[PDB]
Enzyme design. Sequence first.
Site, PDB file in Angstrom:
ATOM      1  CG  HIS A  46      65.353  -1.183 -29.325  1.00 53.99           C
ATOM      2  ND1 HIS A  46      64.403  -0.848 -30.706  1.00 53.99           N
ATOM      3  CD2 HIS A  46      64.451  -1.785 -28.539  1.00 53.99           C
ATOM      4  CE1 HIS A  46      63.690  -1.923 -30.147  1.00 53.99           C
ATOM      5  NE2 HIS A  46      63.788  -2.491 -28.749  1.00 53.99           N
ATOM      6  CG  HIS A  48      68.323   2.132 -33.625  1.00 56.26           C
ATOM      7  ND1 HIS A  48      68.589   0.998 -34.774  1.00 56.26           N
ATOM      8  CD2 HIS A  48      67.395   1.236 -32.825  1.00 56.26           C
ATOM      9  CE1 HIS A  48      67.035   0.829 -34.477  1.00 56.26           C
ATOM     10  NE2 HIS A  48      66.433   0.734 -33.078  1.00 56.26           N
ATOM     11  CG  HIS A  63      68.123  -3.215 -31.470  1.00 57.54           C
ATOM     12  ND1 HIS A  63      67.755  -4.132 -31.060  1.00 57.54           N
ATOM     13  CD2 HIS A  63      67.562  -2.039 -32.229  1.00 57.54           C
ATOM     14  CE1 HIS A  63      65.680  -4.293 -31.541  1.00 57.54           C
ATOM     15  NE2 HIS A  63      65.923  -2.964 -32.444  1.00 57.54           N
ATOM     16  CG  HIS A  71      65.746  -8.023 -29.675  1.00 61.81           C
ATOM     17  ND1 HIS A  71      66.274  -6.660 -29.290  1.00 61.81           N
ATOM     18  CD2 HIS A  71      64.659  -8.034 -28.988  1.00 61.81           C
ATOM     19  CE1 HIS A  71      65.004  -5.494 -28.965  1.00 61.81           C
ATOM     20  NE2 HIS A  71      64.265  -6.590 -28.562  1.00 61.81           N
ATOM     21  CG  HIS A  80      70.921  -6.529 -28.889  1.00 63.45           C
ATOM     22  ND1 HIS A  80      69.911  -5.804 -29.778  1.00 63.45           N
ATOM     23  CD2 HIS A  80      71.496  -7.451 -29.862  1.00 63.45           C
ATOM     24  CE1 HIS A  80      69.166  -7.428 -30.329  1.00 63.45           C
ATOM     25  NE2 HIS A  80      70.573  -8.379 -30.510  1.00 63.45           N
ATOM     26  CG  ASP A  83      67.452  -4.968 -26.689  1.00 64.46           C
ATOM     27  OD1 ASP A  83      67.900  -4.147 -27.915  1.00 64.46           O
ATOM     28  OD2 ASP A  83      68.211  -6.621 -26.907  1.00 64.46           O
ATOM     29  CG  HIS A 120      61.049   0.904 -32.563  1.00 62.47           C
ATOM     30  ND1 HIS A 120      60.668   0.533 -33.511  1.00 62.47           N
ATOM     31  CD2 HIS A 120      62.074   0.738 -31.909  1.00 62.47           C
ATOM     32  CE1 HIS A 120      61.594  -0.051 -34.250  1.00 62.47           C
ATOM     33  NE2 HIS A 120      63.165   0.698 -32.717  1.00 62.47           N
ATOM     34  NE  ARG A 143      64.547   1.362 -37.135  1.00 65.00           N
ATOM     35  CZ  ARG A 143      65.877   1.207 -37.745  1.00 65.00           C
ATOM     36  NH1 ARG A 143      66.980   2.192 -38.262  1.00 65.00           N
ATOM     37  NH2 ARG A 143      66.332  -0.008 -37.949  1.00 65.00           N
TER      38      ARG A 143
HETATM   39 CU    CU Z   1      64.933  -0.454 -32.484  1.00 59.91          CU
HETATM   40 ZN    ZN Z   2      68.155  -5.265 -29.647  1.00 61.07          ZN
END
Ligand code: CU
Ligand code: ZN
Lengths: 153, 153
Positions: A46, A48, A63, A71, A80, A83, A120, A143
């Site tokens: 992702h 962020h 995100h 999401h 998002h 994403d 992640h 993370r």
């Molecule tokens: Cu993330």
């Molecule tokens: Zn997301």
Amino acid sequence: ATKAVCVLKGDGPVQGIINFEQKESNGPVKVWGSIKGLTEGLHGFHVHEFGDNTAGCTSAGPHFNPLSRKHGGPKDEERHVGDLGNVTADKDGVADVSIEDSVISLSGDHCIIGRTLVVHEKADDLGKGGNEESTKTGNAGSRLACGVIGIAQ
Amino acid sequence: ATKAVCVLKGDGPVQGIINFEQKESNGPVKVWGSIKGLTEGLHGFHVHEFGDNTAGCTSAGPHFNPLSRKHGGPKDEERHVGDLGNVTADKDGVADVSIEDSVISLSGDHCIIGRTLVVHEKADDLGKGGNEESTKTGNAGSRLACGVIGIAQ
Ligand SMILES: [Cu+2]
Ligand SMILES: [Zn+2]
Ligand SMILES: [Cu+2]
Ligand SMILES: [Zn+2]
């Protein structure tokens, strides 16, 4: 083409380099590179919101979601901007990344330059996990590594 | 962006966090924070063109210079956008940075988000050293630490 780059690092062994390229400001962004030190299988991936590494990956915030949506996965309508789904690590712990996306941009309002790319611990469930966390984060766990997305030559 | 942040890291002991604030887009950027592990005295402090940490600070490229000017001090008309001059470390090797600059911006053409902040080995001569290198880099020497400038809240 506008180009960007991100060096991902964390407290453990997860590390990599992810490139971004966008030939046209209104075209798709190619995303590619490699991340090592991962457990075999799927890992959430992702952008962020904040490019703030003052607390490692923890200060990156949620995100990147400028349209205030729920999401999802990269191919969902409801997602998002940040994403980008999952990367897959092989039995050697290497995830070779190659994505194209037309929601992120390297300019304008969906610009991801100066934001944080995060890989992640667990699979992103793409918002289909059937709990409130699924629609926030996709249940992708901690993370493991991250970096600020920078302008590249 | 009204705020940005940068974590400085290098091969040696130099490290710190630099904050950027710009409350008005037409307005000065406040730059402040703490860098430690420096030798006492003056150190060049510049925004470099690329947010590329793939080969450490070397891959950040030259000074951010979109108007193709010669190197100067931040008070000069003839300067690179990225020329923030010197920061001063005290006898304990700490620079409590406090700069205000109206040429850098957190938006538009002079945007420094996604680029690299660099703190240098030596004093920046501010373009007044009488050689060709003074007009490019200010003779500030090697890149002790750096980081990609990211969007903050
Ligand atoms: Cu993330
Ligand atoms: Zn997301
Ligand atoms: Cu420099
Ligand atoms: Zn310069």
